[PDB]
Amino acid sequence: YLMEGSYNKVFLAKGNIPAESYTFFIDILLDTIRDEIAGCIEKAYEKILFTEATRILFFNTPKKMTDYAKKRGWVLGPNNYYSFASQQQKPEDTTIPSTELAKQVIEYARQLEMIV
Amino acid sequence: VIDAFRLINANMMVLGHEPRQTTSNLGHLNKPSIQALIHGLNRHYYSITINYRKNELEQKMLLNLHKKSWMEGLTLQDYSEHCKHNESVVKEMLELAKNYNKAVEEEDKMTPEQLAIKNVGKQDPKRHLEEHVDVLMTSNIVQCLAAMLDTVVFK
């Protein structure tokens, strides 16, 4: 379940263990999974309702949502959150190739006209 | 072809003596041509060795021939005739490719003693395609590299 994105089954089974307590490790897994879900939500969204985060992340209304948002800064209130992405850094520049491609062509010429 | 000569007199030969007394072996390094022997030469005149004196100043000056200015090595040619030339070359490459296998198949159906004479009147793609490959590779590589560095030399 953890290898792919399915996360509901993880926390559902975390309250269902037939072997023994196992509570020393499920808490660490919960912390890591909550952190990575917080990391993932940061991408591909420019709008979300405040209660939707409380639904997705299993802390319901313990006042921990505002401190948790203090941990992961966020921007705005009005029951909404926003994110910004650029991703144009790699495009629109031909100077970065200009040297590695020159090296590649020099290598072609070097291994094309040497007597072996 | 430059030679140097001096004359001799026949009266001294009447005395049973020969001119140009020999003291070392550095005077007989070049054998004379048959046409020099046909004419007078040794029975009328003798040749002498020749040498050219060379110094560093004139030799260093003289090697400036055919040198080109720094402008000629940074021009990157028109981008319209280049594609025409590549298109022209590719078609003859295709035709030689089609003609290759015909000569490949019959390479051993005939005795090899006359194999060489079989290629005396008609062209062979194997020799006639390598030059195409070479010129094409050279032109493409140099044209790419020139623009490659020029994109950053200026601004």
mmCIF file of all heavy atoms in Angstrom, chain A residues 94-95 97-99 101-102 105-106 108-109 112-113, chain B residues 134 137-138 140-142 144-145 147-149 151-152, unseen atoms left out:
data_model
loop_
_atom_site.group_PDB
_atom_site.id
_atom_site.type_symbol
_atom_site.label_atom_id
_atom_site.label_comp_id
_atom_site.label_asym_id
_atom_site.label_seq_id
_atom_site.Cartn_x
_atom_site.Cartn_y
_atom_site.Cartn_z
ATOM 1 N N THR A 94 19.785 29.055 -24.314
ATOM 2 C CA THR A 94 20.666 28.257 -25.152
ATOM 3 C C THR A 94 22.131 28.383 -24.763
ATOM 4 O O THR A 94 22.968 27.672 -25.327
ATOM 5 C CB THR A 94 20.504 28.649 -26.626
ATOM 6 N N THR A 95 22.459 29.272 -23.820
ATOM 7 C CA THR A 95 23.847 29.425 -23.398
ATOM 8 C C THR A 95 24.345 28.184 -22.669
ATOM 9 O O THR A 95 25.520 27.817 -22.792
ATOM 10 C CB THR A 95 23.996 30.661 -22.511
ATOM 11 N N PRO A 97 23.714 24.941 -23.154
ATOM 12 C CA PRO A 97 24.296 23.965 -24.085
ATOM 13 C C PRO A 97 25.609 24.417 -24.699
ATOM 14 O O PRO A 97 26.547 23.619 -24.801
ATOM 15 C CB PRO A 97 23.202 23.843 -25.145
ATOM 16 C CG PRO A 97 21.965 23.928 -24.354
ATOM 17 C CD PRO A 97 22.255 25.043 -23.363
ATOM 18 N N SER A 98 25.690 25.682 -25.116
ATOM 19 C CA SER A 98 26.789 26.256 -25.894
ATOM 20 C C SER A 98 28.191 25.741 -25.579
ATOM 21 O O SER A 98 29.070 25.785 -26.444
ATOM 22 C CB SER A 98 26.776 27.773 -25.735
ATOM 23 O OG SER A 98 25.543 28.322 -26.162
ATOM 24 N N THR A 99 28.424 25.255 -24.360
ATOM 25 C CA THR A 99 29.735 24.737 -23.985
ATOM 26 C C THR A 99 29.788 23.216 -24.025
ATOM 27 O O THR A 99 30.740 22.641 -24.562
ATOM 28 C CB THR A 99 30.122 25.236 -22.589
ATOM 29 O OG1 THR A 99 29.239 24.670 -21.614
ATOM 30 C CG2 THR A 99 30.037 26.753 -22.525
ATOM 31 N N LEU A 101 27.830 21.204 -25.707
ATOM 32 C CA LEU A 101 27.693 20.766 -27.090
ATOM 33 C C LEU A 101 28.961 21.032 -27.891
ATOM 34 O O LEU A 101 29.324 20.234 -28.765
ATOM 35 C CB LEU A 101 26.505 21.466 -27.743
ATOM 36 C CG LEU A 101 25.111 21.110 -27.235
ATOM 37 C CD1 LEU A 101 24.059 21.892 -28.000
ATOM 38 C CD2 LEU A 101 24.871 19.622 -27.346
ATOM 39 N N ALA A 102 29.662 22.129 -27.595
ATOM 40 C CA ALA A 102 30.960 22.360 -28.219
ATOM 41 C C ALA A 102 31.950 21.273 -27.828
ATOM 42 O O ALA A 102 32.706 20.775 -28.672
ATOM 43 C CB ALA A 102 31.494 23.737 -27.833
ATOM 44 N N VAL A 105 31.062 18.111 -29.838
ATOM 45 C CA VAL A 105 31.503 18.161 -31.231
ATOM 46 C C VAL A 105 33.021 18.036 -31.317
ATOM 47 O O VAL A 105 33.556 17.379 -32.221
ATOM 48 C CB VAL A 105 30.995 19.444 -31.911
ATOM 49 C CG1 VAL A 105 31.498 19.521 -33.340
ATOM 50 C CG2 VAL A 105 29.477 19.486 -31.887
ATOM 51 N N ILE A 106 33.741 18.652 -30.374
ATOM 52 C CA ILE A 106 35.193 18.502 -30.335
ATOM 53 C C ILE A 106 35.570 17.045 -30.119
ATOM 54 O O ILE A 106 36.526 16.543 -30.716
ATOM 55 C CB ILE A 106 35.800 19.416 -29.254
ATOM 56 C CG1 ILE A 106 35.753 20.873 -29.704
ATOM 57 C CG2 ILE A 106 37.226 19.004 -28.933
ATOM 58 C CD1 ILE A 106 36.155 21.849 -28.628
ATOM 59 N N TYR A 108 33.756 14.395 -31.019
ATOM 60 C CA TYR A 108 33.506 13.727 -32.295
ATOM 61 C C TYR A 108 34.685 13.918 -33.239
ATOM 62 O O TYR A 108 35.197 12.955 -33.823
ATOM 63 C CB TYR A 108 32.232 14.266 -32.948
ATOM 64 C CG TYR A 108 30.939 13.917 -32.249
ATOM 65 C CD1 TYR A 108 29.752 14.538 -32.614
ATOM 66 C CD2 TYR A 108 30.899 12.975 -31.234
ATOM 67 C CE1 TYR A 108 28.566 14.235 -31.988
ATOM 68 C CE2 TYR A 108 29.712 12.664 -30.601
ATOM 69 C CZ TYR A 108 28.550 13.299 -30.984
ATOM 70 O OH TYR A 108 27.364 12.996 -30.360
ATOM 71 N N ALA A 109 35.137 15.164 -33.386
ATOM 72 C CA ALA A 109 36.255 15.448 -34.280
ATOM 73 C C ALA A 109 37.528 14.753 -33.816
ATOM 74 O O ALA A 109 38.318 14.274 -34.637
ATOM 75 C CB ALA A 109 36.479 16.955 -34.382
ATOM 76 N N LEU A 112 37.364 11.102 -34.527
ATOM 77 C CA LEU A 112 37.113 10.859 -35.938
ATOM 78 C C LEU A 112 38.366 10.934 -36.803
ATOM 79 O O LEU A 112 38.380 10.345 -37.888
ATOM 80 C CB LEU A 112 36.081 11.864 -36.467
ATOM 81 C CG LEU A 112 35.508 11.637 -37.867
ATOM 82 C CD1 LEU A 112 34.645 10.391 -37.896
ATOM 83 C CD2 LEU A 112 34.721 12.852 -38.320
ATOM 84 N N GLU A 113 39.415 11.625 -36.359
ATOM 85 C CA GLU A 113 40.588 11.857 -37.201
ATOM 86 C C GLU A 113 41.876 11.638 -36.401
ATOM 87 O O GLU A 113 42.799 12.452 -36.415
ATOM 88 C CB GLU A 113 40.527 13.251 -37.827
ATOM 89 C CG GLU A 113 41.596 13.532 -38.882
ATOM 90 C CD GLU A 113 41.100 14.427 -40.001
ATOM 91 O OE1 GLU A 113 40.115 14.056 -40.673
ATOM 92 O OE2 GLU A 113 41.702 15.499 -40.217
ATOM 93 N N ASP B 134 32.894 11.491 -46.308
ATOM 94 C CA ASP B 134 33.906 12.320 -45.662
ATOM 95 C C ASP B 134 33.561 13.800 -45.767
ATOM 96 O O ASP B 134 33.557 14.524 -44.758
ATOM 97 C CB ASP B 134 35.276 12.041 -46.277
ATOM 98 C CG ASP B 134 36.417 12.498 -45.391
ATOM 99 O OD1 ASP B 134 36.144 13.036 -44.297
ATOM 100 O OD2 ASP B 134 37.586 12.322 -45.790
ATOM 101 N N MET B 137 30.429 14.704 -43.575
ATOM 102 C CA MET B 137 30.711 14.771 -42.145
ATOM 103 C C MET B 137 31.507 16.021 -41.800
ATOM 104 O O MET B 137 31.189 16.728 -40.833
ATOM 105 C CB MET B 137 31.475 13.525 -41.696
ATOM 106 C CG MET B 137 30.699 12.234 -41.807
ATOM 107 S SD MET B 137 31.295 10.955 -40.689
ATOM 108 C CE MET B 137 30.879 11.665 -39.102
ATOM 109 N N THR B 138 32.552 16.312 -42.583
ATOM 110 C CA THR B 138 33.393 17.466 -42.283
ATOM 111 C C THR B 138 32.585 18.757 -42.313
ATOM 112 O O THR B 138 32.647 19.569 -41.376
ATOM 113 C CB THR B 138 34.558 17.538 -43.270
ATOM 114 O OG1 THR B 138 35.486 16.483 -42.994
ATOM 115 C CG2 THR B 138 35.267 18.879 -43.158
ATOM 116 N N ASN B 140 29.307 19.277 -42.044
ATOM 117 C CA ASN B 140 28.307 19.386 -40.988
ATOM 118 C C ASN B 140 28.948 19.693 -39.639
ATOM 119 O O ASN B 140 28.473 20.570 -38.901
ATOM 120 C CB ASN B 140 27.481 18.104 -40.915
ATOM 121 C CG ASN B 140 26.335 18.105 -41.897
ATOM 122 O OD1 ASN B 140 25.245 18.586 -41.595
ATOM 123 N ND2 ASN B 140 26.576 17.570 -43.087
ATOM 124 N N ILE B 141 30.042 19.001 -39.305
ATOM 125 C CA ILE B 141 30.667 19.195 -37.999
ATOM 126 C C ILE B 141 31.197 20.618 -37.863
ATOM 127 O O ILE B 141 30.968 21.291 -36.845
ATOM 128 C CB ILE B 141 31.779 18.155 -37.775
ATOM 129 C CG1 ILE B 141 31.178 16.822 -37.338
ATOM 130 C CG2 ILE B 141 32.779 18.645 -36.743
ATOM 131 C CD1 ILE B 141 32.206 15.742 -37.133
ATOM 132 N N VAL B 142 31.907 21.105 -38.885
ATOM 133 C CA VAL B 142 32.510 22.428 -38.755
ATOM 134 C C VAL B 142 31.435 23.510 -38.727
ATOM 135 O O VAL B 142 31.538 24.487 -37.968
ATOM 136 C CB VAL B 142 33.551 22.668 -39.865
ATOM 137 C CG1 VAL B 142 32.899 22.759 -41.234
ATOM 138 C CG2 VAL B 142 34.353 23.923 -39.572
ATOM 139 N N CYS B 144 28.411 23.222 -37.537
ATOM 140 C CA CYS B 144 27.818 23.221 -36.204
ATOM 141 C C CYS B 144 28.720 23.928 -35.198
ATOM 142 O O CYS B 144 28.269 24.807 -34.454
ATOM 143 C CB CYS B 144 27.527 21.790 -35.757
ATOM 144 S SG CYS B 144 26.320 21.667 -34.420
ATOM 145 N N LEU B 145 30.008 23.573 -35.180
ATOM 146 C CA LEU B 145 30.901 24.095 -34.144
ATOM 147 C C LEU B 145 31.081 25.607 -34.254
ATOM 148 O O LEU B 145 31.170 26.305 -33.229
ATOM 149 C CB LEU B 145 32.254 23.390 -34.211
ATOM 150 C CG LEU B 145 33.298 23.843 -33.189
ATOM 151 C CD1 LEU B 145 32.731 23.813 -31.781
ATOM 152 C CD2 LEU B 145 34.547 22.983 -33.282
ATOM 153 N N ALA B 147 28.976 28.013 -35.316
ATOM 154 C CA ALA B 147 27.840 28.659 -34.670
ATOM 155 C C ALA B 147 27.849 28.404 -33.170
ATOM 156 O O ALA B 147 27.474 29.282 -32.382
ATOM 157 C CB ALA B 147 26.533 28.169 -35.292
ATOM 158 N N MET B 148 28.282 27.209 -32.757
ATOM 159 C CA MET B 148 28.289 26.871 -31.339
ATOM 160 C C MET B 148 29.108 27.870 -30.533
ATOM 161 O O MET B 148 28.639 28.392 -29.516
ATOM 162 C CB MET B 148 28.812 25.450 -31.138
ATOM 163 C CG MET B 148 27.774 24.375 -31.410
ATOM 164 S SD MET B 148 26.754 24.034 -29.973
ATOM 165 C CE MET B 148 25.366 25.120 -30.254
ATOM 166 N N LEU B 149 30.337 28.155 -30.968
ATOM 167 C CA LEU B 149 31.115 29.111 -30.177
ATOM 168 C C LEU B 149 30.708 30.555 -30.466
ATOM 169 O O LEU B 149 30.838 31.424 -29.588
ATOM 170 C CB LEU B 149 32.626 28.945 -30.383
ATOM 171 C CG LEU B 149 33.393 29.465 -31.598
ATOM 172 C CD1 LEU B 149 34.879 29.494 -31.276
ATOM 173 C CD2 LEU B 149 33.171 28.610 -32.804
ATOM 174 N N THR B 151 27.760 31.732 -30.774
ATOM 175 C CA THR B 151 26.588 32.123 -29.996
ATOM 176 C C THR B 151 26.959 32.791 -28.680
ATOM 177 O O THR B 151 26.120 33.478 -28.090
ATOM 178 C CB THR B 151 25.692 30.918 -29.705
ATOM 179 O OG1 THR B 151 26.486 29.834 -29.208
ATOM 180 C CG2 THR B 151 24.946 30.483 -30.951
ATOM 181 N N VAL B 152 28.184 32.595 -28.198
ATOM 182 C CA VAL B 152 28.594 33.137 -26.909
ATOM 183 C C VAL B 152 29.780 34.084 -27.018
ATOM 184 O O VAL B 152 29.983 34.904 -26.106
ATOM 185 C CB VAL B 152 28.902 32.004 -25.905
ATOM 186 C CG1 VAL B 152 29.177 32.555 -24.513
ATOM 187 C CG2 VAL B 152 27.747 31.047 -25.846
#
